[PDB]
Ligand binder design. Structure first.
Ligand SMILES: [Cl-]
Ligand SMILES: [Cl-]
Length: 164
């Protein structure tokens, strides 16, 4: 498994504008278009991102291009972040994916706020970090996805994504 497969599973793929779990306009593989409630604004942001008049729909290749851009942006965001970088550099390959996943869903900002969990992960206190990560709105609002990511940080394996 790799980060692309992992996020593909957690975010799915939709080729028409849709509302994400928080009601925000999104498309493709979890690519957020805007937080505004206006559908026009979203169609606007869509065309600007794609570079053509899409009228709210894109192709699979367009979706995959956004996804490649988004994963690259997240990793780079992590590396530019002073709170994130040290944790990311301390982790093994599987676990790094769980961090990227969080960053892709909630942004650099959002993750850098899980201060206590981040320190636990840095110290490799897996079971403790998992408990701490669960005391969050994130786990309470999207528990199935949060459980998969948390199990990933806990075990360092892909078991939570296996058989999906
Ligand atoms: Cl809580
Ligand atoms: Cl969920």
């Amino acid at each position: 498994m790799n980060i692309f497969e992992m996020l593909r599973i957690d975010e799915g793929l939709r080729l028409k504008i849709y509302k994400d779990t928080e009601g925000y306009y999104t498309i493709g593989i979890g690519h957020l278009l805007t937080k505004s409630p206006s559908l026009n604004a979203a169609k606007s942001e869509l065309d600007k991102a794609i570079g053509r008049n899409c009228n709210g729909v894109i192709t699979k290749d367009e979706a995959e291009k956004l996804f490649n851009q988004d994963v690259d942006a997240a990793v780079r965001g992590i590396l530019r972040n002073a709170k994130l970088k040290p944790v990311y550099d301390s982790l093994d390959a599987v676990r790094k994916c769980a961090l990227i996943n969080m960053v892709f869903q909630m942004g650099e900002t959002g993750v850098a706020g899980f201060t206590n969990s981040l320190r636990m992960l840095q110290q490799k206190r897996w079971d403790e970090a998992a408990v701490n990560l669960a005391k969050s709105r994130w786990y309470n609002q999207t528990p199935n996805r949060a459980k998969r990511v948390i199990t990933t940080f806990r075990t360092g394996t892909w078991d939570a994504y296996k058989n999906l």
